[PDB]
Amino acid sequence: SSNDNIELVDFQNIMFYGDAEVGDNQQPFTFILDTGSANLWVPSVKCTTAGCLTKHLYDSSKSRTYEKDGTKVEMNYVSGTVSGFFSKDLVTVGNLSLPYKFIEVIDTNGFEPTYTASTFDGILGLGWKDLSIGSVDPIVVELKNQNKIENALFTFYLPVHDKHTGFLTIGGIEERFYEGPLTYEKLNHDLYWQITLDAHVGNISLEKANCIVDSGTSAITVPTDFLNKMLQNLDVIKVPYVTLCNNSKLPTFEFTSENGKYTLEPEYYLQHIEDVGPGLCMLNIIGLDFPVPTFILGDPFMRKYFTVFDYDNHSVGIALAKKNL
Amino acid sequence: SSNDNIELVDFQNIMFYGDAEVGDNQQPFTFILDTGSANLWVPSVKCTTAGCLTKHLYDSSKSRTYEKDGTKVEMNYVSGTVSGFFSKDLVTVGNLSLPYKFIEVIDTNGFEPTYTASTFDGILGLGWKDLSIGSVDPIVVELKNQNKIENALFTFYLPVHDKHTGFLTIGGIEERFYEGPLTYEKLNHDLYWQITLDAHVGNISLEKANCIVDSGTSAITVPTDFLNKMLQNLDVIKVPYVTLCNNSKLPTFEFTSENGKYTLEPEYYLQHIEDVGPGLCMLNIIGLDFPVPTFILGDPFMRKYFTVFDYDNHSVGIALAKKNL
């Protein structure tokens, strides 16, 4: 394996984690791998919030390579905020290492209940520089400049609950992860991994909508209006959205470009909740409005499609993920 | 027992059922007991929807007391609609029986996925006449006129998940179900069991708000605006509301009148969801706006407070429910 492969484990089909280390002594941590952010952060041994008591903590005094910074910083996510200060130390991802600037988190009380209720210790961003705090070059970009990897790209072969684990691969594209054609879509912005695609679900359509491929989002988000029409005569209620898993009215999402066609059948966005009711399924779709028509192709899409995030070529490559390796 | 007692069983802490029969041969059915509606309905052997295949069905041809009507009718609920026609036959509730007009349901496809995903067969309304279809006198009202019960009232001692079963009692008030004072609140309308109460949660307050005591609602509903302010600096996120069960910022609902004071502490509106995360709790509160400030005091409130629904006196009696009988 000339590339750097990091095994991924699924967490209740809503999150997936990967491990990496910080410090010369390889202190272990479990990370959310987020293409939607650009900073790396780990909780400090100096973090004294209740959430931190159950986590793997980072102790800079145990690492020779630790380079003090101390610049105050706070990072925000959908589920909250974490605060601390910048620090620099050796970061090891898979079989590659490099001195890297990250956020040493001191306070997580503004990131609850997500933090305490989840198994991850920190978050490792895989977005673009301009999207980070402190103007930190993306880790993969850094590795490329240090000539540690053949290409400034990484790929995601996501794990599938009760089926198989996944892999984050840095440096190269491995054909073993996908079948069918691998199609590239140019980014429309060098901030997020956002591309342009036409969308069609039923009779409802939307031309050249913005689509963000995001590993940190557990669902597929759709424009409010779009969702409403999509679920008008479909038998899908919602406790003040759930439906029968065998609902044959359920539509298939269709995303097309000049170079490719991607579809998301109900089997990919329906989550079983038998424990609540026989044959009952939850709709892993969310109504979310951005200033312009936008779809967040989150984990549901990525579980079906192997994805390539290319910094050098400013594009996202998409191909059908193999059901089994 | 000079009163008619019907045992109630809890269903995943979101619903509770009671059994009753229809027909001279006592055909058995499981019912949602709804103070928010005024009709009784059972699925017919003539119902051929998928939802009906798993239910106890009513066969009028097996009952001598069956009186054909056939008037077409459709009933709507929060979770959907069911259609059929009126029929009349002997209805047995506990140890009391009486010929009663009900809806024989033929189509339930407009009531999914609730119907198939739930264990009940039909719904028995316990609301006011004007709130029904077909101008049918409430069953308890009917029983009183037939001199089968001492008073036109019924009480609810709701079951508590993993603690104890409950009781629907018709005809009289039994002190064994409650402790502390029993206070009566006059109805402000002869349609719903709606009363007037001042509400205070934190610093937020609302004078003489309308409060509907509803056995068919699994949560406590609060005015949108009211909820927002209530959950502003409380650590309660919400997947595009959950919180740590030990959150000490959680406020206590306070409802007061000229005759009584009722409170709802966090332990009564927090639902444990350990299977999702350690010490994680769901907020059994819902943001719902009515034309005027309204609270639906659903099951969470009724589980804490024993309630008396008096038709003769047009009031709702409230008292602390005994933790154990």
mmCIF file with all atom_site columns, N, CA and C in Angstrom, chain B residues 131-161:
data_model
loop_
_atom_site.group_PDB
_atom_site.id
_atom_site.type_symbol
_atom_site.label_atom_id
_atom_site.label_alt_id
_atom_site.label_comp_id
_atom_site.label_asym_id
_atom_site.label_entity_id
_atom_site.label_seq_id
_atom_site.pdbx_PDB_ins_code
_atom_site.Cartn_x
_atom_site.Cartn_y
_atom_site.Cartn_z
_atom_site.occupancy
_atom_site.B_iso_or_equiv
_atom_site.pdbx_formal_charge
_atom_site.auth_seq_id
_atom_site.auth_comp_id
_atom_site.auth_asym_id
_atom_site.auth_atom_id
_atom_site.pdbx_PDB_model_num
ATOM 1  N N  . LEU B 1 131 ? -68.062 18.197 19.719 1.00 0.00 ? 131 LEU B N  1
ATOM 2  C CA . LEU B 1 131 ? -66.757 17.880 19.151 1.00 0.00 ? 131 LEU B CA 1
ATOM 3  C C  . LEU B 1 131 ? -66.794 16.603 18.313 1.00 0.00 ? 131 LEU B C  1
ATOM 4  N N  . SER B 1 132 ? -67.949 15.944 18.276 1.00 0.00 ? 132 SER B N  1
ATOM 5  C CA . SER B 1 132 ? -68.087 14.703 17.521 1.00 0.00 ? 132 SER B CA 1
ATOM 6  C C  . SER B 1 132 ? -68.712 14.896 16.149 1.00 0.00 ? 132 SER B C  1
ATOM 7  N N  . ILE B 1 133 ? -68.710 13.815 15.376 1.00 0.00 ? 133 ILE B N  1
ATOM 8  C CA . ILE B 1 133 ? -69.311 13.807 14.052 1.00 0.00 ? 133 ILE B CA 1
ATOM 9  C C  . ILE B 1 133 ? -70.578 12.987 14.230 1.00 0.00 ? 133 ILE B C  1
ATOM 10 N N  . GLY B 1 134 ? -71.686 13.465 13.676 1.00 0.00 ? 134 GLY B N  1
ATOM 11 C CA . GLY B 1 134 ? -72.935 12.734 13.797 1.00 0.00 ? 134 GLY B CA 1
ATOM 12 C C  . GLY B 1 134 ? -73.692 13.053 15.073 1.00 0.00 ? 134 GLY B C  1
ATOM 13 N N  . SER B 1 135 ? -73.278 14.116 15.757 1.00 0.00 ? 135 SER B N  1
ATOM 14 C CA . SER B 1 135 ? -73.924 14.543 16.996 1.00 0.00 ? 135 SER B CA 1
ATOM 15 C C  . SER B 1 135 ? -74.236 13.365 17.919 1.00 0.00 ? 135 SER B C  1
ATOM 16 N N  . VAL B 1 136 ? -73.193 12.668 18.353 1.00 0.00 ? 136 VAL B N  1
ATOM 17 C CA . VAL B 1 136 ? -73.361 11.520 19.233 1.00 0.00 ? 136 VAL B CA 1
ATOM 18 C C  . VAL B 1 136 ? -73.068 11.921 20.677 1.00 0.00 ? 136 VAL B C  1
ATOM 19 N N  . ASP B 1 137 ? -74.016 11.674 21.577 1.00 0.00 ? 137 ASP B N  1
ATOM 20 C CA . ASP B 1 137 ? -73.807 12.005 22.984 1.00 0.00 ? 137 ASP B CA 1
ATOM 21 C C  . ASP B 1 137 ? -72.639 11.182 23.492 1.00 0.00 ? 137 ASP B C  1
ATOM 22 N N  . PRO B 1 138 ? -71.747 11.793 24.292 1.00 0.00 ? 138 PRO B N  1
ATOM 23 C CA . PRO B 1 138 ? -70.587 11.080 24.838 1.00 0.00 ? 138 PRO B CA 1
ATOM 24 C C  . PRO B 1 138 ? -71.040 9.798  25.526 1.00 0.00 ? 138 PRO B C  1
ATOM 25 N N  . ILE B 1 139 ? -70.215 8.761  25.468 1.00 0.00 ? 139 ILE B N  1
ATOM 26 C CA . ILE B 1 139 ? -70.588 7.491  26.070 1.00 0.00 ? 139 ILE B CA 1
ATOM 27 C C  . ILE B 1 139 ? -70.881 7.596  27.563 1.00 0.00 ? 139 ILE B C  1
ATOM 28 N N  . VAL B 1 140 ? -70.074 8.366  28.292 1.00 0.00 ? 140 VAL B N  1
ATOM 29 C CA . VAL B 1 140 ? -70.283 8.530  29.732 1.00 0.00 ? 140 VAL B CA 1
ATOM 30 C C  . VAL B 1 140 ? -71.583 9.288  29.989 1.00 0.00 ? 140 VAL B C  1
ATOM 31 N N  . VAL B 1 141 ? -71.873 10.259 29.130 1.00 0.00 ? 141 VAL B N  1
ATOM 32 C CA . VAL B 1 141 ? -73.100 11.036 29.251 1.00 0.00 ? 141 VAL B CA 1
ATOM 33 C C  . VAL B 1 141 ? -74.282 10.083 29.053 1.00 0.00 ? 141 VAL B C  1
ATOM 34 N N  . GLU B 1 142 ? -74.177 9.225  28.044 1.00 0.00 ? 142 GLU B N  1
ATOM 35 C CA . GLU B 1 142 ? -75.228 8.252  27.758 1.00 0.00 ? 142 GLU B CA 1
ATOM 36 C C  . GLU B 1 142 ? -75.465 7.345  28.959 1.00 0.00 ? 142 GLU B C  1
ATOM 37 N N  . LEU B 1 143 ? -74.385 6.780  29.493 1.00 0.00 ? 143 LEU B N  1
ATOM 38 C CA . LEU B 1 143 ? -74.488 5.893  30.645 1.00 0.00 ? 143 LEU B CA 1
ATOM 39 C C  . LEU B 1 143 ? -75.212 6.567  31.805 1.00 0.00 ? 143 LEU B C  1
ATOM 40 N N  . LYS B 1 144 ? -74.943 7.853  32.012 1.00 0.00 ? 144 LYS B N  1
ATOM 41 C CA . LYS B 1 144 ? -75.586 8.587  33.098 1.00 0.00 ? 144 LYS B CA 1
ATOM 42 C C  . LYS B 1 144 ? -77.094 8.699  32.871 1.00 0.00 ? 144 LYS B C  1
ATOM 43 N N  . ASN B 1 145 ? -77.484 9.015  31.642 1.00 0.00 ? 145 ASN B N  1
ATOM 44 C CA . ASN B 1 145 ? -78.897 9.154  31.306 1.00 0.00 ? 145 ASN B CA 1
ATOM 45 C C  . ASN B 1 145 ? -79.640 7.827  31.449 1.00 0.00 ? 145 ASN B C  1
ATOM 46 N N  . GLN B 1 146 ? -78.929 6.725  31.247 1.00 0.00 ? 146 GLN B N  1
ATOM 47 C CA . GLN B 1 146 ? -79.542 5.413  31.365 1.00 0.00 ? 146 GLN B CA 1
ATOM 48 C C  . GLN B 1 146 ? -79.494 4.959  32.808 1.00 0.00 ? 146 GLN B C  1
ATOM 49 N N  . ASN B 1 147 ? -79.035 5.853  33.673 1.00 0.00 ? 147 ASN B N  1
ATOM 50 C CA . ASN B 1 147 ? -78.967 5.564  35.093 1.00 0.00 ? 147 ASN B CA 1
ATOM 51 C C  . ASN B 1 147 ? -78.070 4.373  35.399 1.00 0.00 ? 147 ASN B C  1
ATOM 52 N N  . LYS B 1 148 ? -77.011 4.215  34.614 1.00 0.00 ? 148 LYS B N  1
ATOM 53 C CA . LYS B 1 148 ? -76.084 3.112  34.817 1.00 0.00 ? 148 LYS B CA 1
ATOM 54 C C  . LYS B 1 148 ? -74.882 3.496  35.675 1.00 0.00 ? 148 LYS B C  1
ATOM 55 N N  . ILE B 1 149 ? -74.683 4.797  35.866 1.00 0.00 ? 149 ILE B N  1
ATOM 56 C CA . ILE B 1 149 ? -73.592 5.289  36.701 1.00 0.00 ? 149 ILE B CA 1
ATOM 57 C C  . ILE B 1 149 ? -74.112 6.427  37.576 1.00 0.00 ? 149 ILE B C  1
ATOM 58 N N  . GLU B 1 150 ? -73.500 6.595  38.743 1.00 0.00 ? 150 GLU B N  1
ATOM 59 C CA . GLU B 1 150 ? -73.919 7.618  39.694 1.00 0.00 ? 150 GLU B CA 1
ATOM 60 C C  . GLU B 1 150 ? -73.705 9.053  39.213 1.00 0.00 ? 150 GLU B C  1
ATOM 61 N N  . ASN B 1 151 ? -72.640 9.278  38.446 1.00 0.00 ? 151 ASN B N  1
ATOM 62 C CA . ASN B 1 151 ? -72.312 10.615 37.942 1.00 0.00 ? 151 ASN B CA 1
ATOM 63 C C  . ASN B 1 151 ? -71.781 10.586 36.513 1.00 0.00 ? 151 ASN B C  1
ATOM 64 N N  . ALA B 1 152 ? -72.000 11.667 35.768 1.00 0.00 ? 152 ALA B N  1
ATOM 65 C CA . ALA B 1 152 ? -71.500 11.752 34.402 1.00 0.00 ? 152 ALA B CA 1
ATOM 66 C C  . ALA B 1 152 ? -70.077 12.310 34.461 1.00 0.00 ? 152 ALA B C  1
ATOM 67 N N  . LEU B 1 153 ? -69.147 11.479 34.914 1.00 0.00 ? 153 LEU B N  1
ATOM 68 C CA . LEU B 1 153 ? -67.748 11.878 35.007 1.00 0.00 ? 153 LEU B CA 1
ATOM 69 C C  . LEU B 1 153 ? -66.893 10.637 34.858 1.00 0.00 ? 153 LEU B C  1
ATOM 70 N N  . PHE B 1 154 ? -65.628 10.835 34.507 1.00 0.00 ? 154 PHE B N  1
ATOM 71 C CA . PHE B 1 154 ? -64.686 9.735  34.402 1.00 0.00 ? 154 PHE B CA 1
ATOM 72 C C  . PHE B 1 154 ? -63.349 10.273 34.889 1.00 0.00 ? 154 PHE B C  1
ATOM 73 N N  . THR B 1 155 ? -62.475 9.382  35.331 1.00 0.00 ? 155 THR B N  1
ATOM 74 C CA . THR B 1 155 ? -61.182 9.815  35.837 1.00 0.00 ? 155 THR B CA 1
ATOM 75 C C  . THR B 1 155 ? -60.047 9.026  35.200 1.00 0.00 ? 155 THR B C  1
ATOM 76 N N  . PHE B 1 156 ? -58.866 9.634  35.150 1.00 0.00 ? 156 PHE B N  1
ATOM 77 C CA . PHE B 1 156 ? -57.693 8.972  34.606 1.00 0.00 ? 156 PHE B CA 1
ATOM 78 C C  . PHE B 1 156 ? -56.558 8.912  35.614 1.00 0.00 ? 156 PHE B C  1
ATOM 79 N N  . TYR B 1 157 ? -56.102 7.693  35.879 1.00 0.00 ? 157 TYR B N  1
ATOM 80 C CA . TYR B 1 157 ? -54.959 7.441  36.741 1.00 0.00 ? 157 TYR B CA 1
ATOM 81 C C  . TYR B 1 157 ? -54.100 6.760  35.688 1.00 0.00 ? 157 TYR B C  1
ATOM 82 N N  . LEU B 1 158 ? -53.220 7.522  35.052 1.00 0.00 ? 158 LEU B N  1
ATOM 83 C CA . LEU B 1 158 ? -52.409 6.958  33.983 1.00 0.00 ? 158 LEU B CA 1
ATOM 84 C C  . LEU B 1 158 ? -51.305 6.006  34.399 1.00 0.00 ? 158 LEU B C  1
ATOM 85 N N  . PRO B 1 159 ? -51.016 5.022  33.537 1.00 0.00 ? 159 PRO B N  1
ATOM 86 C CA . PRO B 1 159 ? -49.955 4.062  33.840 1.00 0.00 ? 159 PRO B CA 1
ATOM 87 C C  . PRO B 1 159 ? -48.634 4.793  33.681 1.00 0.00 ? 159 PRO B C  1
ATOM 88 N N  . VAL B 1 160 ? -47.606 4.307  34.363 1.00 0.00 ? 160 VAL B N  1
ATOM 89 C CA . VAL B 1 160 ? -46.283 4.903  34.269 1.00 0.00 ? 160 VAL B CA 1
ATOM 90 C C  . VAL B 1 160 ? -45.327 3.804  33.834 1.00 0.00 ? 160 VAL B C  1
ATOM 91 N N  . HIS B 1 161 ? -44.655 4.033  32.713 1.00 0.00 ? 161 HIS B N  1
ATOM 92 C CA . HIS B 1 161 ? -43.715 3.072  32.150 1.00 0.00 ? 161 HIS B CA 1
ATOM 93 C C  . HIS B 1 161 ? -42.802 2.451  33.204 1.00 0.00 ? 161 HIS B C  1
#
